[model samples]
Target: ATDTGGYAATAGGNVTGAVSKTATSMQDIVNIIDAARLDANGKKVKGGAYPLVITYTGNEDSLINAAAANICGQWSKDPRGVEIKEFTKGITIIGANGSSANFGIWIKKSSDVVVQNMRIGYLPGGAKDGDMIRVDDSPNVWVDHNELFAANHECDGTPDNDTTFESAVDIKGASNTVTVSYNYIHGVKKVGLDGSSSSDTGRNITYHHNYYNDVNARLPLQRGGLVHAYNNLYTNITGSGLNVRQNGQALIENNWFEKAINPVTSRYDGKNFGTWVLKGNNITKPADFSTYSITWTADTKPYVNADSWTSTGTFPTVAYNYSPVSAQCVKDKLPGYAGVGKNLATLTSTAC
Candidate 1:
């Protein structure tokens, strides 16, 4: 165990309880991570690779900057070999003191990482600038099983005065295959997840089984759009569940919406407009809004099997006579996918 500074200054002089096995001062954790990357079991693909695994069973407020920067630095230094494998036992990052200036974890120029089973939140720091987890130009990432909340700090309306109207997870620059799942996120006034910006053409990005609550009310610019949000729970949202702008594609399915005020808006670029599917979802519209802006076009042979369907909305010339009954029959005739749903909405309807 590396010597994390605050780890030894507590009442008992060290972190006790579950995280005691993995708790250290933030700097020691970084050193341990650096060492792990050089070891065989902790193999890093790149030269001088540093892979880190953080166990979050203790209080980690004193090392916020160190922890976040180390995670980001691993990727910045070497994208291929740097990885952070957070154990099943989660950690708690409390920013009780106002010393920390940035985020919980910030990754720049790195990839092949995993941040799992941790709980990260803001302490009584008054305010801070940056992302809870900022993945900048990084690829091949998996962030799951974490609980993120920005509480105790409040301004006119945002989660923090320093927040830049971004998301809990902000992805910038050509990021691909990043999966954000099984997390509980709330109390931040901006977007729950902001995968916007044409600068970062994020592809194959997925969001599933997370809870987003009471966001985008004051900041009209904050929108949740352009990602795969499935089987999650949403409460007290202002904008549509998603705002797929700048040729961003979204796959929204199996989500329960409560007090949803806006419609899922799509800004078409003639390239990525109709690339999303909204299926098997239960929607509750907000008060004073009459209808949503989603347009459903019927197509012949729009889907392969009866119930298995896809959206031919992007096709140049779709057959108008596509039948739901026939689509369901076509689906029934095919073998079922193992451990998955029979939802036709999950099938691909178009090429590319």
Candidate 2:
């Protein structure tokens, strides 16, 4: 058996004995996250073992303003002490409706938090800052079973086009021990990013069993981290995919790539570099290795040393208890349950 990284024990809202908090408005949702308590009529009660099981009463669009900066921004002192889960009736957190205002669902400076079974992002005609869900400097966090996408303004593959969204999920600022699994992340310029900048070294993260459809790049653009990516389905990728750069190391395994231009590569900006260990991945259309190997200039660096790079055949030998899904089974299994409101209990029955 292999290790689960930050999953298993730290994943899910595990609200077996939690207090029930029905949120009437968006403010009620924020209040529960901040105070870690529920308002029962007028009385305040501790949110129970896994904190509060928050359920939205009406449509969440009525709860948030069209121009709010951070909607469900939860900055908790003890993330383990404050947890949230969708109610049995189902919940969806819609971004700024139709308006192109900047908004995000930020989980910053927290630990041991689980965000699951929710729909988050902007719709058509809605635009916002690239990161829809920004996890900054957080640890022991698991984001699972969520459907995340950004609004697309330009459909053409142009460099100077006005792409509305950046990254669906951005985990940065020294965040460690995070697992993003069983989610649908797509229709954006960059799907996700592990590290924020060249100096950030966020490590020990796991991404598995997710669906990436019609995305441009950064099936996570990792900067500095020890990442494990497996069993993901990348389909209709317009630009490059799965870039390991800026001193990052990734263990890429058992993923299926269909009709992608550039599936995997290591990129550098004269100063920061990246590498990967690839195995058992099935790419439908083979990409030219030279497409990712460009010697570009930054900060007055010299131009023109373009060379193609391949995997070095090095992999992390740590005991990963979680088995990688077979490459033959990726397309069959991922799309069925890799999005928001998926019944996780049925995932095991449909074996690839």
The estimated TM-scores of all candidates read 0.55, 0.71
Identify the leading candidate in terms of lDDT: 2
Write the residue-wise lDDT of candidate 1 on 167-201 in tens digits.
46666554454566555566655543444444444
Backbone clashes (count) for model 2: 7
Model 1 scores what on Cα lDDT? 0.41
- lDDT for 283 in candidate 1 is 37
Best by the TM-score measure: 2
Model 2, runs deviating above 4 Å: 1-17, 37-50, 56-103, 123-130, 154-163, 284-310
Clashes of 1: 19
Candidates' lDDT values, in order? 0.41, 0.56
